[PDB]
Amino acid sequence: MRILHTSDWHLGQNFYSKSREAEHQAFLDWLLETAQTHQVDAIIVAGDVFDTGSPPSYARTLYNRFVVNLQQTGCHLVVLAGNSDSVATLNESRDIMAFLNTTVVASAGHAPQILPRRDGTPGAVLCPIPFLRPRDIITSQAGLNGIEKQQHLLAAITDYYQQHYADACKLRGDQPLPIIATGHLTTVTLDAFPAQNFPPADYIALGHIHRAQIIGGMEHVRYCGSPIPLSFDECGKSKYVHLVTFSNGKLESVENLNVPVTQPMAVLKGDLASITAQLEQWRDVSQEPPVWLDIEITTDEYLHDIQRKIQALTESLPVEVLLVRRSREQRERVLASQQRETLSELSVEEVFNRRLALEELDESQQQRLQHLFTTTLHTLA
Amino acid sequence: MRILHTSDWHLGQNFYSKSREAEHQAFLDWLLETAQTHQVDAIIVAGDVFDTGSPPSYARTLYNRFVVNLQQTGCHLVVLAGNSDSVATLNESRDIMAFLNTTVVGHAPQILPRRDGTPGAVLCPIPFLRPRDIQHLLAAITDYYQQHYADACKLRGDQPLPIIATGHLTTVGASKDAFPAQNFPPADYIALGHIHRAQIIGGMEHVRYCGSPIPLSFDECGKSKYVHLVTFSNGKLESVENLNVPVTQPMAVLKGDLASITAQLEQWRDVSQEPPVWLDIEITTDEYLHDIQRKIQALTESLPVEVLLVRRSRRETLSELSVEEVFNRRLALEELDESQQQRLQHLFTTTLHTLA
Amino acid sequence: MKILSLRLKNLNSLKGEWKIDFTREPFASNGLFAITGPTGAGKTTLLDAICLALYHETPRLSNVSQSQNDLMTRDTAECLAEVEFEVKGEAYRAFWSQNRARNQPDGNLQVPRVELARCADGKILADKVKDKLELTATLTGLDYGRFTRSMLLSQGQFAAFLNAKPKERAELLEELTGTEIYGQISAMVFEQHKSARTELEQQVEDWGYLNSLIGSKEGDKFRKFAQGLTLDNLVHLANQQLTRLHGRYLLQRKASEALEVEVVDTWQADAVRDTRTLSGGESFLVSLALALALSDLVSHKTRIDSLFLDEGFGTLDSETLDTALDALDALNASGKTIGVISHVEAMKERIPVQIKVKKINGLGYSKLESTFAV
Amino acid sequence: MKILSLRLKNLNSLKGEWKIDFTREPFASNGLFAITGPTGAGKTTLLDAICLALYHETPRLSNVSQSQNDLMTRDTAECLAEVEFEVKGEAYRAFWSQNRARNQPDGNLQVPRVELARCADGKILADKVKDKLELTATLTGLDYGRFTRSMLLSQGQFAAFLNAKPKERAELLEELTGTEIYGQISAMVFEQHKSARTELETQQVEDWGYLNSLIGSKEGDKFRKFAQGLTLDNLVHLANQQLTRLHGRYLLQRKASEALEVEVVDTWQADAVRDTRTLSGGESFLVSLALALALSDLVSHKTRIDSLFLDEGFGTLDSETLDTALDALDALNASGKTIGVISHVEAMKERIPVQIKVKKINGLGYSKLESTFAV
DNA sequence: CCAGAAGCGTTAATGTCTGGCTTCTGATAAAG
DNA sequence: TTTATCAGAAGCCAGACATTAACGCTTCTGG
Numbered sequence A: 001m002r003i004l005h006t007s008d009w010h011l012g013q014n015f016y017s018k019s020r021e022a023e024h025q026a027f028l029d030w031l032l033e034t035a036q037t038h039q040v041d042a043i044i045v046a047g048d049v050f051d052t053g054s055p056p057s058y059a060r061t062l063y064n065r066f067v068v069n070l071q072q073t074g075c076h077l078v079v080l081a082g083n084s085d086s087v088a089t090l091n092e093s094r095d096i097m098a099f100l101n102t103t104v105v106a107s108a109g110h111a112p113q114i115l116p117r118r119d120g121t122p123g124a125v126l127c128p129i130p131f132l133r134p135r136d137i138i139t140s141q142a143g144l145n146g147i148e149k150q151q152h153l154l155a156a157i158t159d160y161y162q163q164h165y166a167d168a169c170k171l172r173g174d175q176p177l178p179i180i181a182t183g184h185l186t187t188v189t190l191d192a193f194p195a196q197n198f199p200p201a202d203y204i205a206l207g208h209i210h211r212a213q214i215i216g217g218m219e220h221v222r223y224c225g226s227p228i229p230l231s232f233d234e235c236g237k238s239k240y241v242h243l244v245t246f247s248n249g250k251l252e253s254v255e256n257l258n259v260p261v262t263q264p265m266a267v268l269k270g271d272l273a274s275i276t277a278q279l280e281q282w283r284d285v286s287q288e289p290p291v292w293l294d295i296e297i298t299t300d301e302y303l304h305d306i307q308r309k310i311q312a313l314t315e316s317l318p319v320e321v322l323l324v325r326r327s328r329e330q331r332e333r334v335l336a337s338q339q340r341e342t343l344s345e346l347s348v349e350e351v352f353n354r355r356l357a358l359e360e361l362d363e364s365q366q367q368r369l370q371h372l373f374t375t376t377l378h379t380l381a
Numbered sequence B: 001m002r003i004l005h006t007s008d009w010h011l012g013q014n015f016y017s018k019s020r021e022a023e024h025q026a027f028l029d030w031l032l033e034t035a036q037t038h039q040v041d042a043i044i045v046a047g048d049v050f051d052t053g054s055p056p057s058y059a060r061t062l063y064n065r066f067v068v069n070l071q072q073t074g075c076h077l078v079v080l081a082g083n084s085d086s087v088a089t090l091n092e093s094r095d096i097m098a099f100l101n102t103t104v105v106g107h108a109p110q111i112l113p114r115r116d117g118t119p120g121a122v123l124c125p126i127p128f129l130r131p132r133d134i135q136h137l138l139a140a141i142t143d144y145y146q147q148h149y150a151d152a153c154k155l156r157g158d159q160p161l162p163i164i165a166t167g168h169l170t171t172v173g174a175s176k177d178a179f180p181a182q183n184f185p186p187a188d189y190i191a192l193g194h195i196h197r198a199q200i201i202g203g204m205e206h207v208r209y210c211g212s213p214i215p216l217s218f219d220e221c222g223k224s225k226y227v228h229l230v231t232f233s234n235g236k237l238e239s240v241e242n243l244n245v246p247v248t249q250p251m252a253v254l255k256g257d258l259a260s261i262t263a264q265l266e267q268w269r270d271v272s273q274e275p276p277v278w279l280d281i282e283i284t285t286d287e288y289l290h291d292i293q294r295k296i297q298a299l300t301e302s303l304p305v306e307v308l309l310v311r312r313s314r315r316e317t318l319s320e321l322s323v324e325e326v327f328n329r330r331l332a333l334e335e336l337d338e339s340q341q342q343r344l345q346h347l348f349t350t351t352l353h354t355l356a
Numbered sequence C: 001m002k003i004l005s006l007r008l009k010n011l012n013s014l015k016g017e018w019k020i021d022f023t024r025e026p027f028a029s030n031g032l033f034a035i036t037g038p039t040g041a042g043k044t045t046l047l048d049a050i051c052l053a054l055y056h057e058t059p060r061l062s063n064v065s066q067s068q069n070d071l072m073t074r075d076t077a078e079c080l081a082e083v084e085f086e087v088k089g090e091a092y093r094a095f096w097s098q099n100r101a102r103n104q105p106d107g108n109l110q111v112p113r114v115e116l117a118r119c120a121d122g123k124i125l126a127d128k129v130k131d132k133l134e135l136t137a138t139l140t141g142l143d144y145g146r147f148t149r150s151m152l153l154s155q156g157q158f159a160a161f162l163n164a165k166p167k168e169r170a171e172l173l174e175e176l177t178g179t180e181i182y183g184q185i186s187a188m189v190f191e192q193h194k195s196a197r198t199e200l201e202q203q204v205e206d207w208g209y210l211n212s213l214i215g216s217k218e219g220d221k222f223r224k225f226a227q228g229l230t231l232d233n234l235v236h237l238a239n240q241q242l243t244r245l246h247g248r249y250l251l252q253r254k255a256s257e258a259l260e261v262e263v264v265d266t267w268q269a270d271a272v273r274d275t276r277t278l279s280g281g282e283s284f285l286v287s288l289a290l291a292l293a294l295s296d297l298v299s300h301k302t303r304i305d306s307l308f309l310d311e312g313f314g315t316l317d318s319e320t321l322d323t324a325l326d327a328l329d330a331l332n333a334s335g336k337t338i339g340v341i342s343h344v345e346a347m348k349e350r351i352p353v354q355i356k357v358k359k360i361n362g363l364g365y366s367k368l369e370s371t372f373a374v
Numbered sequence D: 001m002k003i004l005s006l007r008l009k010n011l012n013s014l015k016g017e018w019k020i021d022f023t024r025e026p027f028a029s030n031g032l033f034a035i036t037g038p039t040g041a042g043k044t045t046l047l048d049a050i051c052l053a054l055y056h057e058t059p060r061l062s063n064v065s066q067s068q069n070d071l072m073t074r075d076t077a078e079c080l081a082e083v084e085f086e087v088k089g090e091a092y093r094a095f096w097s098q099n100r101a102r103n104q105p106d107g108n109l110q111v112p113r114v115e116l117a118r119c120a121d122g123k124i125l126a127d128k129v130k131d132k133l134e135l136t137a138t139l140t141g142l143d144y145g146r147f148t149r150s151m152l153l154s155q156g157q158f159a160a161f162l163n164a165k166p167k168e169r170a171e172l173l174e175e176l177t178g179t180e181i182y183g184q185i186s187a188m189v190f191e192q193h194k195s196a197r198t199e200l201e202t203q204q205v206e207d208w209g210y211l212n213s214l215i216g217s218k219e220g221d222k223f224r225k226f227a228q229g230l231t232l233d234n235l236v237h238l239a240n241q242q243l244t245r246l247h248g249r250y251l252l253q254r255k256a257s258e259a260l261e262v263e264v265v266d267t268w269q270a271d272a273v274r275d276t277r278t279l280s281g282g283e284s285f286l287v288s289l290a291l292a293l294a295l296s297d298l299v300s301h302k303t304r305i306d307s308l309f310l311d312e313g314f315g316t317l318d319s320e321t322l323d324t325a326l327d328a329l330d331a332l333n334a335s336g337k338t339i340g341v342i343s344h345v346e347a348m349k350e351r352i353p354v355q356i357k358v359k360k361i362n363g364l365g366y367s368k369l370e371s372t373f374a375v
Numbered sequence E: 001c002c003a004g005a006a007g008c009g010t011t012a013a014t015g016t017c018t019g020g021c022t023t024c025t026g027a028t029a030a031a032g
Numbered sequence F: 001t002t003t004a005t006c007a008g009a010a011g012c013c014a015g016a017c018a019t020t021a022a023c024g025c026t027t028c029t030g031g
């Protein structure tokens, strides 16, 4: 039994006043495309299917066109609410979407269901658990502590998974069917989950982590990661919708199809001359999607209108700036001066020299600036 | 041929921070039930469906739970746009609803198939003709119903199917400039929206306003809450039955001074009404509005009712007056003259709608 | 809104965990209660946990976060503050707790945790800060800024309302009653004029005269002409709270563009004089009257049943202080539980219910009674 | 800078030409005096007439000019405050006065006739307003704000110097020393740089700009804050000794930030580094008191001043800290500084018997004091 | 019964500044 | 760990006021 495990779509996310509208749409056809090619029967998207609980109005149309165009294939789909979305937004369309093989289960305490296959045979045992809001399982009491409130939650979700797994043991019975459980949380600053407390399930898809990784050496627990880059630390990385085919009610394979990236992004470190060289690689070559950039300037110089120096570069180029950052975090103040000096006895030549020894500059600009400084002292005299 | 005719639902309506949740939820089950009683062909809603372009998140859940319950009826559903409803609020699931016999709306007309598969009638889906999308504003609306009547006449030809007309607009003559009632194209029926008062317009039976199926404001506390069940005879209208909806949330607009009000307050004493009865008390004194409500909260606690508003329709506060009058009060030190006061008055109401 | 209980631990000088309650054998009356103790040994701190657990912002410190948390005492691992406030019959809870990294007294400061739980069902409503503040605004009906001037009254702040910038006071007035459209129109009209001026870089007359009349950034002009009526409503409640409190003065809205209250001098035959020209005792009593009226303006929407206030009674006169205290007890004929913290020994003889705060003997901390310890 | 005599007429509730002198026998004894009475009897007015006369500005009001004389007692024609004081051994006299229109209780408020004259010389040293302001600035050595946060401390405003924004603290610290040139250097850096950068509508403007974020640009700020840090260190070194003379609770030290701030230190803890915004009320009053004394003692070398007028804040202490603070103030009046204090605290009766005890006329709306002072 | 002077009360040019406002870099809270 | 979002700071424009300088009204007051 094949399943496509993605998550973290983050639909309708504004990205420094830019959108991921066509950036999702050119993925969502590809996700629809690889379904019939690999003959999958039930896609799972485990979490963060919206950015905010009131998404923009097109951000449903990217999602509503997805669920109708799935019905050409007739393949099932499970949608789990993540931490990001308001639960009341996904339960807007829980009841109607049962007509379209789309069990969008938003709230906690839902009943375990049986996945069908393409021929109509039951394909998999599903334990759908969306992101547990802490209100939906635990009640607060008086007399608590600070740390203890986090630990009391952690035991509650743990025995919720032990309870929700035990329902599947009655529902599977004696048939050789695989157990698929979802969730939107973190695992192995003690705000995480211990994976040994996860149930003895056959495969547990998960979410909330954007780096696609195995966790704990158990291959049947896979953070599938985002299908597209949403940041500039993992921009140059790759994205993998997890393909898990099952064999005889057990696990066969974990295939990782890459995603064709439609919107190119890159990050640059260093100083302005190093940014000047890294901008030269886009000179002759052309880009039909305008490439975005992060420019982490680690400069020391003053650099009058540093956003204009960037703006002076990329006028006749197919490169788009989107952000620009500098290490403007530094301290500057007079020391103790051996705890004895008076300001009337120190001349202006001293405290100006006392102010320049705090920076990096050595020789050439210094003998230029001190002439520039002493012109001001004389032009009042 | 049975077709239900509703209009102006205004779902998720803010009502002085009180809700219209249980009003609709005790209506929507009743709505499909009468459709389940009489085995309707199709239902049409004549706009003003949601409240605003950004409805609250619960307001869809009544609307979708209506539609999934409509699938156990097998009846066609046609949803018309309104004046307050955007395209983007109804381009949300414009093709989700295609798989559930639910056509939603610059569109070609269509046929309504019956429960047994036969083509039943002819519909002219007419959303709100925005002048941003279409004297001159009166010019294009007038001939469009002549433009669409030939689209209505020639789509059937010699077929014995009745035509119904839709729309969501305003009409001259109907008590609460507008579309002329005498210029309507003589189709077999005209359903129409945006008028929350239920009445026949012009004296022709085939043109109608069914009003709102629920009371919206206190002032509109009329008992004439109807849904228009129409019947067709092989291409012609048979009749229209006005069906009374049940009431669930009673209101009471008490007027006068405290002498006449407190006498009316004992009418709801010891009756133990299971929904808290709502009020629009209209006091007529010269006392301060922030302190006249001090006596009321003790008087309303004993009764099983909940007050909603207090007004003096005759000092003054900010929760009493309207935006033009304080704007007109702000013209005390401003030279209104002739031209200057007219432009400010006309450009002001433009500015107030820009935030609307 | 009143307070049903309070818990804290290692807040400031009050080391260890302590928990006072407002449904016990003391506080069996709804009378006013005092808090004595040596000066600067945990006295405004018991009234600081009330601000902290409910709005994360003390009167003294601007904000507390993972950075810049001066609040919790040195060589302690965590802090917490927990109230039980009741509106309209139903209890609630709040729980702002913050630990240190690896429970070490010299470590980093982790992300703060909040609850806003219900006390009857036990269920919680907003486990995140940005939802907890806006779900206390719905609940109490009063925002943290409103709470600072219309409920609690901090030390050396009684100059809050009457010595504010007119934008500040007008904004506070627009947050209590009325609607935010009355400045939103000004903001939108400033956008209209900015657009019609960036075009032209009677077209002047489009947003020229109207912009000059009513229209500025963030709702200045028209919001002030709006609150120029709500102030004229509020001054009457100020008068009615004032005459039983201090009969020498009446208030009056001055007919001006910047809304400024104005004293009417009865002992000088209706002399008019500006409100900054008041004595210390008169300014404290008029600010008390104005805040009590300010709470009783939104009393029709939300009942506001509590009023804590710190030292202004050394500032008052020892003869008319008895008149002020008897008027305060006359305001205790409602359910307004009125907390008072000061040092006047005759006043603390008048106030029976004393939460005594014993300062430690050179330890460097403070304590409380064994009834409230935990 | 020690006031010798004060003479006012219709200040607020001191109707009828009330004068005091500190050359009188009860003030000639030591130089420590208290004031008591019912509230609103004009104690702040009595401490207000002197700053009105020396600067035409009060802590309560804003500006008493031709318009909006809110000071003057209701329904009288003229109000005037006049002072004879000393600097460097020799005496001077300031005289501020204001009429109504036509000697009537109401009318057009006229321009305030003022003067500043050397007493026992008959020499009108200053006649108009601005000349009087600048001449008493150079002749007293104190500005307006330096009077109202280092010598006179008004009630409820003692947290001004501790909790001002660092611009209007760097202002006071700049003016306190004779180093006001930085507020011209750093302004002229912006004057050169904005001209050079509007000349581009050039690596030289880049060097001007690299100076321009290395020092202050408009007003003083940056270079000014960098410069007064050493004077703040000198001031907290003085105030540390001043405060441990006062109460052995917290030391002070400067802090490593651009903003000219002072952190406190806890002797009992022995390792405390918190900001001053979380001090207690009584310790904040003692920090403002000792800090003001240190600021006054810093300019000891030129135009040394000897007076202190604490309006209120002693109620914020108790019989366990107030007594210690007054016992330390006794060491200051044993020195040449002659302080004064408004107090409602009856526990300071045994401390200070030298009173300017005032009275009210039965709730009529005026006041009076001992008729041995009145003319 | 009064005119000159002396002072007093009045208005018209100009210098500082308090208040929007805007442009910007800094903090804060949240999803990896 | 990074990304919207608000919050505070520094600088710019400007009208509002403070001040100074000049111009009639009243009043002793002398014959």
Ligand SMILES: Nc1ncnc2c1ncn2[C@@H]1O[C@H](COP(=O)(O)OP(=O)(O)O)[C@@H](O)[C@H]1O
Pocket (backbone or CB within 6 Å): C011, C012, C013, C039, C040, C041, C042, C043, C044, C045, C046, C070, C071, C072, C073, C074, C155, D274, D278, D279, D280, D281, D282
């Ligand atoms: N960072 C801190 N940690 C612990 N205790 C502090 C801290 N800052 C101040 N304190 C102490 O907390 C106490 C608070 O004084 P308090 O009595 O609450 O103020 P007030 O006198 O204005 O009511 C003071 O004794 C002070 O020494």
Ligand SMILES: Nc1ncnc2c1ncn2[C@@H]1O[C@H](COP(=O)(O)OP(=O)(O)O)[C@@H](O)[C@H]1O
Pocket (backbone or CB within 6 Å): C273, C277, C278, C279, C280, C281, D012, D013, D038, D039, D040, D041, D042, D043, D044, D045, D046, D070, D071, D072, D073, D074, D155
């Ligand atoms: N312009 C004025 N007209 C009439 N009365 C005034 C005026 N200014 C002040 N007062 C009276 O003078 C008193 C000033 O009291 P204040 O000296 O401030 O008291 P404290 O010394 O306690 O601060 C107040 O009672 C006030 O009524």
Ligand SMILES: [Mg+2]
Pocket (backbone or CB within 6 Å): C043, C044, C155, C310, C311, D281
């Ligand atoms: Mg205190």
Ligand SMILES: [Mg+2]
Pocket (backbone or CB within 6 Å): C279, C280, D043, D044, D155, D311, D312
């Ligand atoms: Mg006083």
Ligand SMILES: [Mn+2]
Pocket (backbone or CB within 6 Å): A008, A009, A010, A047, A048, A082, A084, A208
């Ligand atoms: Mn996500």
Ligand SMILES: [Mn+2]
Pocket (backbone or CB within 6 Å): A047, A048, A082, A083, A084, A184, A207, A208, A209, E031
């Ligand atoms: Mn997530």
Ligand SMILES: [Mn+2]
Pocket (backbone or CB within 6 Å): B008, B010, B048, B194, B196
């Ligand atoms: Mn409508």
Ligand SMILES: [Mn+2]
Pocket (backbone or CB within 6 Å): B008, B047, B048, B082, B083, B084, B168, B193, B194, B195
């Ligand atoms: Mn309508």
